């Protein structure tokens, strides 16, 4: 996820579909992004 | 609804082969499965959604003593394990 | 990517949002026993 | 000695589309189109019963 | 600049834009269904009375 | 292949691993259902403040040494050969223990004229809500509800 | 957990009341639904609930 | 009764509940009385108080 | 004591006696003396349950 | 022995605390359920257990 070109292949099931980051925020890195952001490119 | 079928083969392999190994010592860079994600990103260069995360072969399964239950909708596995692997040591059970 | 819903009327415009985070590993290595006496490695 | 750091795979969701007709509510609606709304300015039904 | 750095950069913006435009296309598909319930609750007094 | 300690090191082999939370939500959680045994007992055992040094003593030194052993005659939490300069009080060991680990019954002075309605609830024993849950993130309300 | 999961959604803003009602509904539950297997050993229905 | 320690805690709810699943007590299950926790050992208590 | 329209007493000493005697530590007792323009400014409590 | 095994269903403990809590539960299981068949012969699905 951090390296975005790695996530161009997801290679796994995005499966839970629950409200992310309203949970424990246990992630070492996570970005709550709207439709676009310049750092993606 | 017991005695189901799962994989006995322990789950796959990551090796630092020539895709990794070159990037490993020369730059210090490491990419999980640089083969396809190097290939695919070379081809989309000549014209994320990387759905080749892990779906290759579906390796060999066998049959084990497994206890499944029907909790309403879901098919839920259920096993208790003291006599299995926590038995007779000086390690506490969790 | 959290999708949005087109809300109607005098409401703020919901942008197409994006979420990018990273995680790091831990290590927590395991440990192994020592088991070797003398003269099994040698003979008489 | 060698010393690398690693990006160990990354995983993206696949956000789903919904056709509203592909949902059980649309029996309560009548999905009928009208490409020239913005000039219609009014409407009525005179409902003889 | 005619380099492979450029075409990756060019394709990334479109892989956002297509991912952006698919969001708002699903939005009115969602938002209609959202609006489907609101006028049904402007009416419909509760069961008890 | 670690340090040879005599007749061989005897050859451990450790293995590295590591694990992340591959899931954006509260995956894989938990429950709580049974009560095996109440490890430390429900007990009558009081608190001794003469266990530690904390206070200026009486200046009438004839009085305090009378009250020294008067309190710490035979408490289960009463030391023998009392406090050196640095170190613990070395709470003695009774010859047997039956029910479990011992409790500590600490006491705080209260006026008699409160309600018994308070304490028919899970309430804060200090008499006022104190935890860092109720504050509203205005950077000063934490100690404000406290004192 | 179960009291929180209904509130992951909306509010949690200057509706800080809803943060407080999250709390007052939380602590009542932990007094209530713990050792439930054990609080109910015969209510065959409630365990399956 | 500690002015620092309750004030030392955060208040983001995501990290609050998971510490309750594995907190470190101040007590010891390896001593005849509640000896205050020795600085080298772990306990892994639940502790809602 | 609102600033809407409440005829005060004759004795000016009596009013500032009783108004302050009423408003000591009420949860709706306003903090500062009331402005002409603006709300009655209900003082924010530190915590709530 | 039904508590004796579940004493050994741990790491092991000789720290004099578990030895006490072994005994104080062991005497309760003997004081209460020793002659169970005939103590509860009116029941069923416990003699099963």
Curated annotation (Swiss-Prot), chain B:
Domain of life: Viruses
Subcellular location: Virion; Host nucleus
Quaternary structure note: Homomultimer. Makes the hexons and eleven out of twelve pentons. Interacts with triplex proteins 1/TRX1 and 2/TRX2; adjacent capsomers are linked together in groups of three by triplexes, heterotrimeric complexes composed of one molecule of TRX1 and two molecules of TRX2. Interacts with scaffold protein; this interaction allows efficient MCP transport to the host nucleus. Interacts with capsid vertex component 2/CVC2. Interacts with the small capsomere-interacting protein/SCP.
Family: Belongs to the herpesviridae major capsid protein family.
Function: Self-assembles to form an icosahedral capsid with a T=16 symmetry, about 200 nm in diameter, and consisting of 150 hexons and 12 pentons (total of 162 capsomers). Hexons form the edges and faces of the capsid and are each composed of six MCP molecules. In contrast, one penton is found at each of the 12 vertices. Eleven of the pentons are MCP pentamers, while the last vertex is occupied by the portal complex.
Name of the protein described by the UniProt record: Major capsid protein
Gene that produces this protein: MCP
Curated annotation (Swiss-Prot), chains G, J:
Location in or out of the cell: Virion; Host nucleus
Covalent S-S links between cysteines: none
Function summary: Self-assembles to form an icosahedral capsid with a T=16 symmetry, about 200 nm in diameter, and consisting of 150 hexons and 12 pentons (total of 162 capsomers). Hexons form the edges and faces of the capsid and are each composed of six MCP molecules. In contrast, one penton is found at each of the 12 vertices. Eleven of the pentons are MCP pentamers, while the last vertex is occupied by the portal complex.
Subunit: Homomultimer. Makes the hexons and eleven out of twelve pentons. Interacts with triplex proteins 1/TRX1 and 2/TRX2; adjacent capsomers are linked together in groups of three by triplexes, heterotrimeric complexes composed of one molecule of TRX1 and two molecules of TRX2. Interacts with scaffold protein; this interaction allows efficient MCP transport to the host nucleus. Interacts with capsid vertex component 2/CVC2. Interacts with the small capsomere-interacting protein/SCP.
Family that this chain belongs to: Belongs to the herpesviridae major capsid protein family.
Protein name per the record: Major capsid protein
């Amino acid at each position: 996820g951090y390296r975005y070109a790695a996530a161009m292949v997801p290679t796994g099931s995005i499966l839970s579909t629950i409200e992310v980051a309203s949970h424990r925020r246990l992630f070492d890195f996570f970005a709550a992004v709207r439709s676009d952001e310049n750092s993606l490119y | 609804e017991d005695t189901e079928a799962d994989v006995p083969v322990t789950y796959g392999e990551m090796v630092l082969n020539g895709a990794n190994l070159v990037t490993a010592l020369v730059m210090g860079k490491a990419v999980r499965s640089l083969d396809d994600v190097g290939r695919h990103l070379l081809d989309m260069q000549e014209e994320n959604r990387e759905t080749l995360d892990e779906l290759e072969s579906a390796p060999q399964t066998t049959r084990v003593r497994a206890d499944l239950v029907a909790i309403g909708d879901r098919l839920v596995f259920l096993e208790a394990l003291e006599k299995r692997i926590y038995a007779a040591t000086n390690v506490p059970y969790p | 990517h959290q999708p949005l819903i087109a809300r109607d009327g005098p409401h703020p415009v919901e942008q197409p949002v994006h979420n990018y985070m990273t995680k790091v590993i831990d290590r927590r290595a395991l440990n192994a026993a020592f088991s070797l006496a003398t003269e099994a490695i040698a003979l008489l | 000695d060698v010393e690398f750091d690693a990006l160990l795979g990354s995983y993206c969701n696949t956000l789903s589309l919904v056709r509203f007709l592909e949902l059980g509510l649309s029996v309560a609606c009548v999905c009928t189109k009208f490409p020239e709304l913005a000039y219609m300015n009014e409407g009525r039904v005179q409902f003889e019963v | 600049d005619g380099t492979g750095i450029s075409l990756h950069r060019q394709l990334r913006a479109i892989q956002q834009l297509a991912r952006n435009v698919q969001a708002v296309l699903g939005a009115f598909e969602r938002g209609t269904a959202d609006q489907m319930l609101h006028v049904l609750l402007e009416k419909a007094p509760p069961l008890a009375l | 292949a670690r340090h040879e300690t005599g007749g061989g090191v005897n050859f451990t082999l450790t293995q590295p691993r590591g694990n992340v939370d591959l899931g954006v939500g509260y995956t894989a959680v938990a429950a709580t259902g049974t009560v095996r045994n109440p490890v430390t007992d429900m007990g009558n055992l009081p608190q001794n403040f003469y266990l530690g040094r904390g206070a200026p003593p009486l200046l009438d030194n004839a009085a305090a040494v009378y009250l020294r052993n008067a309190v710490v005659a035979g408490n289960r939490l009463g030391p023998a050969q009392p406090l050196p300069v640095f170190g613990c009080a070395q709470v003695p060991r009774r010859a047997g223990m039956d029910h479990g680990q011992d409790a500590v019954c600490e006491f705080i002075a209260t006026p008699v004229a409160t309600d018994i309605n308070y304490f028919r609830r899970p309430c804060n024993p200090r008499g006022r809500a104190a935890g860092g849950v109720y504050a509203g993130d205005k950077e000063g309300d934490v100690i404000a509800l406290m004192y | 957990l179960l009291p929180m999961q209904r509130y992951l959604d909306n509010g949690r803003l200057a509706t800080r009341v809803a943060r407080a009602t999250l709390v007052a509904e939380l602590k009542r539950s932990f007094c209530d639904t713990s050792f439930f297997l054990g609080k109910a050993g015969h209510r065959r229905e409630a365990i399956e609930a | 009764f500690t002015a620092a320690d309750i004030t030392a805690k955060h208040r983001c709810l995501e990290r609050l509940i998971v510490e309750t699943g594995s907190a470190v007590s101040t007590a010891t299950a390896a001593s005849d009385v509640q000896f205050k926790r020795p600085p080298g050992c772990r306990e892994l208590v639940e502790d809602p108080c």
